[PDB]
Design an enzyme around this catalytic site. Structure first.
Site, PDB file in Angstrom:
ATOM      1  N   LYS A   1       5.838   3.611   1.135  1.00 37.23           N
ATOM      2  CA  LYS A   1       6.749   2.400   1.125  1.00 37.23           C
ATOM      3  C   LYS A   1       7.997   2.875   0.455  1.00 37.23           C
ATOM      4  CE  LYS A   1       3.519  -0.978   2.652  1.00 37.23           C
ATOM      5  NZ  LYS A   1       4.465  -1.604   3.862  1.00 37.23           N
TER       6      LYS A   1
ATOM      7  N   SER B   1       6.490  -9.508   1.203  1.00 31.30           N
ATOM      8  CA  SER B   1       5.478 -10.711   1.147  1.00 31.30           C
ATOM      9  C   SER B   1       4.970 -10.956  -0.228  1.00 31.30           C
ATOM     10  CB  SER B   1       4.248 -10.399   2.207  1.00 31.30           C
ATOM     11  OG  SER B   1       3.931  -9.109   1.763  1.00 31.30           O
TER      12      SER B   1
ATOM     13  N   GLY C   1      12.974   1.742  -1.661  1.00 31.42           N
ATOM     14  CA  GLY C   1      11.783   1.125  -1.384  1.00 31.42           C
ATOM     15  C   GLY C   1      12.172  -0.021  -0.285  1.00 31.42           C
TER      16      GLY C   1
ATOM     17  N   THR D   1       3.431  -6.243   2.455  1.00 30.57           N
ATOM     18  CA  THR D   1       4.052  -5.268   1.913  1.00 30.57           C
ATOM     19  C   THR D   1       4.639  -5.856   0.513  1.00 30.57           C
ATOM     20  OG1 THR D   1       4.995  -4.298   3.956  1.00 30.57           O
ATOM     21  CG2 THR D   1       6.006  -3.417   1.797  1.00 30.57           C
TER      22      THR D   1
END
Lengths: 173, 254, 173, 173, 173, 173, 173, 63, 173, 173, 173, 61
Positions: free
Chosen positions: D33, D125, D45, D1
């Site tokens: 997202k 990430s 988000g 993500t």
């Protein structure tokens, strides 16, 4: 930490260093590891985690004020608190308590231990060191329970990287 | 409804309860002093003598008594943190079994009363009740759901039907209202079309439906006296609007 | 994080960097690690997990407003909350609090610590670094408790990969 | 993500990819997202565990509806829920919320973080990747907060094996 | 376990093997991994720990009977049970549910997932295998949603050491 | 460490930080991680273990020295030395080499790699950052090659705990 | 990585992606994982460690070169260089080699493997995916060999986070 | 009895529930059929109720 | 710890050493590991963690006084306490209880065990040692249940580094 | 432990060894692992942790007496206790229950399993051994369900180091 | 893998499955795990690593070739090569070799083993299974040697996830 | 008039009593006979008005 206690000649002493070790560093090297309880009727030396040390020290004070200073008992009454169906967590530390009559050692796991013939007690990292020293002394010399406990602490501080020479000793009376 | 139209059309003390325990009886008696002191005050007509009728009202209840327990399933096992759901179902056993309740009129027996328990039983099931009750409730009646065509009927045929109710409540205003047949479908099918896309409250859905329909008329019936307006297809439609599923998904689903 | 506090000449200062480190990256390098409590009566520096830092910072504010700003006590009262039969979790962080009179350090484990003769305090990853610097200074120079705490922070930021030069220092009065 | 947000020219944008990665496989590559909260007053988000993502997203919605959409506060009020004596588990995820006035980041551990001078935010990430891109852009180009957040997401998808090019971006107004 | 579901031509099918694997042995090779719910309105395929499989299967049945068989919702209502302040443990398993209108996948962690344009679904160890097969088929052939789901299961059983050829397939209507 | 090299307009530049981290402390901050080889005609930046770095770097020179400084071949000939039935130590470091004509990246395990179409290479812990940055500046600006290196190194050093801002940059006229 | 090879109708083709993943970041996306050997008469696809891949691939060539390019033999000869008292290192990679007449798969541990009856081979992380796909398209369609590869690679690259869609395919007329 | 060995064994009370199902055909139309003597025997009791339901059980929670 | 019990000739004995071992050191070597319960009706030998030893010893005393000393039952009633829906923690220790009629062994996990034909019992670290000795004796010699239990303990102390020769033996009557 | 059950010719048998293994030693080798429940209506064989064995054995007895011995159901009713919102711990063991009509296996995790066509059941460490033997027998010989279950146990005891030849077998009627 | 061999009536047979498991996937299912050596007079079944298996198998042949194929000796001479200081690859595989007169089992660590009295050998993951079976069928039936193998392999393949039913059997007339 | 009703809607597992009040308050909006210190008073025809912010829950709750 290194807490040792010798009893000889109606004299009871309890010494311990003063090195608050955190990891492999030193946060403070003068702390008092042996305090006085019940206006000065019993001696107490703790060894373990700064926190859990006190949480078990102050927890034995209650059982003392709540029992007219009956050491040998108050101890047991404290222990029983861990021997139930609903335990009291667990405490990373041990206590060495002694008054004009008895001297004991209580673990935060919940158990009480009585010395052996010699009546010498030691807890903490540098334990057995000071212990071996004491026993060494007590058995081969006519030394004051204070001088021994003092001398024994030194030996230990010079071997345990977690123990210093700056210690505090309390005796009775 | 089928249990209520069994009290007025058979004359007997009625009482509905939603799961004190004996209060179900103490109240069954407080609703009997209306078919004895309203049927023997207009029939046997002073005549006071309570001490005389403290066994004329009870002779009624003791025999003519109907107890209704709505939504009972709500008290069946599964339920370990609240075994009290089996407690109620238990303290309610003496009543379906046979005991003596002490009301403020005297001792009233129960053995001969009549109990009717309703339940959706979607969650639990019959057998999920204490054995005692399973054997003291031998009659198992299975009702059915109301269909599209079933709302088209319940909307008129029955006495006091909605069509009728709003017809008369709007005549007392000096106005007349026509409910065409080709428009009862789009009022019964528009009440079903709502139960399949939200809570299926059943008939009660109709009430909420009409209220939206007569929302335009019920307000301006005064400033428009003595008129006959036809309520048909094209009218029912441009009366409410359109009902679609919220959006459920697009909110908390990936 | 590197929080150090020096007390010299009726002056009490408490500085700390501002590097919010996450793993081995940097989420923000300007945060305030030393805040003011009780309308400006006590200084507080936290070091630990962003969350547990505050959960213990705001937890010591309560014990302050609830005790007329009696530092040395309010601290202890906080500690006691961990020394019971029903503990308060555990907090991954430490606090350095000091006012015009005292200066302390409180751990989320439940314990209070007093400085030593000098009166220098430091907590966090780059602790001992700033500490060694302070002590170095305080003992061999006539420097303002502020200038030291400032200078000491730098030394530490240049050694700890988890400490920066952008720090915030608060002193009293 | 990879969720990043840039604010420049009274414009606030918040983009994120759409790769639901499970282990080292791909369960879905189009998810949204970044959602809209409060009829379209705030942008949100999320990044973390599918579940704990929402459990914290829907948990911040409550604090918004219950506070007239006062972002900067509602956030804090949410955080406080983790800073008590009775915590709220812990959530494996982070949220980036921003409205016409502010923009923040909230962790499921219980803490709120404010951007730095540039007002650029990124979580997940591929965070820092998109972040380094943003900063890169915002600082050396006159680009729309949207175009940046778009461009920045790409850079990140091309580096994080857990991020794709199929993203969803929401801006205000 | 290998559960796959393909939807094509107003047809919805859900197949799964029947190998109850325990460790590296086989306790039974004929179990039914796809059951029918709501008198035959919805299809359900589970994959995970024998126990936690059912504990989540029977847990979704409740939310169905309690909601007039409104799949897409009942699912969400189930999910929400994990997104609270008081969670529902956690279930080592996943569910694939589909009726004449929708088809979903629900994890015991608490989350619902919708297919992609091809709405094909697969869960369990041999997932992606059957999935890759399905997609392969669905996209390059005019095959019955049943035939595919059948064919795809085989491919998977021939690769996953935890999946067999003895499977059970249910379709609607 | 962080080393990045961009090339555009007959210009090739290789730049890196100078922070020599040791565990989580910093042994030095002014190191030169990029030097010139084969009579100032090849750029070489190394990142990895302070030693192995040199040992790798030092082997590549031998090779350059042995082959009229043919960047490309030298690299391969070097790489070859690991890819034999034999084997070499297996150095924990990477190099970014580049001369007037080429730009390459060599690893201690033994393999060469060419940049992607944009001709940008980055190695080290803060690589991807510097990269992300560079990529952005190259794609969205007519910025000087040398300048991009400069700007990206920073962005990275600002995100990496193991990278500082004291740079060393060499370009190839 | 993902490499698969299908052969049907006197046609043999080997295809792979081009994503060079490094940990969870991507060092490159346009790698050529399949190349031609022995004077454009053998196809070779390698998957595993960027180095070991090559070192393996390069050994199989020496062998081809040494045996008039007898695919089969070469392969065994290479493998048999592992089955002895002496070793050859555990090469972290696998090869898929195939010429007009054969199709084989070699591993670094030293063993050759023939396809099963369908003559389809796949190696890499996204192997079984590309396989499942291929197997499906081979069994249920009169699709071109090259095409199946093209197709399956995709399906796989879409499920594997370590495989991209930038392909490289070589067929053997 | 055949019913108590395949569900709750409520004992005698089971009989009540049994008869109620038996006299479910007669108790309703006894008015429109006055003054008749009908024999309740084997063949009548049988084609009066039906047959027991041995609870699915397996069908669901079992593998 | 080494607790063994032999029953032969209407005689029942239960011996155990007296080494309180802590880690690899010795805190005390004279403790009583076999105590008397119910004014002298039953013999009890514990082995395990100093604390959990007693917590289970004193826990079996209750079930004895509360059951007129009905050993064989009181045991079972104790066990049942662990076989519920709400367990009693777990105790790191085992008990060997025996009276004029029976002799048993109870674990802090919750289970009771009866001897075999020979009626010999042993628990603790040096168990099987003393056991093998007992069995050895009992089966090949006409020795007093006391002499055996004594002799057996010795054998065990001379092999277990966690057992000493200073033991305490109790018999009935 | 090795518990196996074969059903052939209206005969149902359930055998199991009798080796109470503790660690790698043997505490007793004659225990009864198969008991009778409901005055002799159902057979029960347990395998697992001495304690958790019974805690689940006695836990299935309740569900039997509370359900007129309706095996197939009582089992399920037991299982359901683990499939809730408030679980029942977890039990390290499995049960094999069978009466004149059915035969099952219940795990302390909460699940019920039915045999396959052959109706052979086995649990415990030496399971599959005895199982393979049974199946071997049942399928190729006309042997009494008892003789098989006997013979099968032996085979298993001669392979599992945690199983002996001293077993107890119960059949019906 | 599963390989078993029985011998009765001047007949020796060695058989094994053909599933080549790779982790938990299946690279192939038609391998031949048993072959004929020394001019078709010796049976060899290998189980272990696809590679090491062959290298072990291959060594045993180089030995049979060197000693007039004296099964017994050859095997020993092989084991002998390992049984010194001079270290040998220490292959991770086992062999079941047998000719007209003998039947042995050799391991990679270097040791030979004769069967027990029945003359049944089994190696591999599903060995014991196939064994239990064989043992059963040999003791309780006048079945054909070849047949027992056939049947046991199955029984085993049905319990082992790493063994299939595609068998390969060689007997010795 | 029932002010702030939302406060008794589901979501609420440690206190299902919020749905209990909303339940014991059904007989009143439905139609029952309350026994006051003046006599029996019917309800069927009374008029109820419930207020609610419904920011948290919603009607359907």
């Amino acid at each position: 930490t290194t807490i040792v206690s010798v009893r000889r000649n109606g004299q009871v002493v309890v010494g311990g260093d003063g090195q608050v070790s955190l990891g492999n560093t030193v946060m403070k090297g003068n702390a008092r590891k042996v305090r006085r309880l019940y206006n000065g009727k019993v001696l107490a030396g703790f060894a373990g985690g700064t926190a859990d040390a006190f949480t078990l020290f102050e927890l034995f004070e209650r059982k003392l004020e709540m029992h007219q200073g009956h050491l040998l008992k108050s101890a047991v009454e404290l222990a029983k608190d861990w021997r139930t169906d609903r335990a009291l967590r667990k405490l990373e530390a041990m206590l060495i308590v002694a008054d004009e009559k008895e001297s004991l050692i209580i673990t935060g796991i919940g158990d009480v231990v009585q010395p052996e013939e010699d009546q010498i007690l030691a807890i903490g990292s540098g334990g057995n060191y000071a212990l071996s020293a004491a026993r060494a002394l007590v058995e081969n010399t006519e030394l004051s329970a204070h001088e021994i406990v003092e001398k024994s602490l030194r030996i230990a501080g010079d071997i345990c990287v977690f123990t210093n020479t700056n210690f505090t000793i309390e005796e009775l009376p | 409804e089928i249990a209520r139209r069994l009290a007025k059309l058979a004359n007997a003390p009625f009482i509905k309860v939603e799961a004190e325990v004996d209060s179900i009886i103490r109240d069954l008696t407080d609703s009997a002093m209306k078919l004895v002191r309203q049927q023997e005050i207009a029939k046997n007509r002073k005549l006071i003598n309570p001490e005389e009728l403290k066994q004329k009202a009870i002779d009624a209840v003791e025999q003519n008594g109907i107890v209704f327990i709505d939504e009972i399933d709500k008290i069946c096992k599964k339920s370990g943190a609240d075994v009290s759901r089996e407690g109620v179902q238990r303290d309610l056993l003496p009543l379906v079994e046979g005991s003596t309740v002490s009301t403020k009129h005297g001792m009233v027996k129960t053995d001969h009363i009549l109990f009717i328990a309703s339940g959706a039983f979607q969650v639990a099931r019959p057998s999920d009740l204490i054995p005692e009750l399973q054997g003291r409730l031998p009659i198992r009646v299975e009702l059915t759901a109301l269909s599209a065509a079933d709302f088209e009927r319940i909307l008129t045929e029955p006495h006091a039907s909605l069509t009728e109710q709003y017809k008369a409540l709007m005549a007392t205003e000096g106005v007349n209202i026509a409910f065409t047949t080709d428009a009862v479908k789009k009022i019964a099918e528009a009440a079903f079309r709502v139960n399949e896309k939200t809570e299926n409250i059943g008939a009660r859905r109709l009430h909420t439906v009409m209220e939206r329909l007569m929302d335009k008329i019920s307000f301006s019936a005064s400033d428009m006296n003595g008129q006959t307006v036809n309520i048909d297809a094209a009218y029912v439609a441009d009366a409410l609007g359109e009902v679609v599923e919220n959006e459920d998904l697009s909110r908390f689903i990936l």
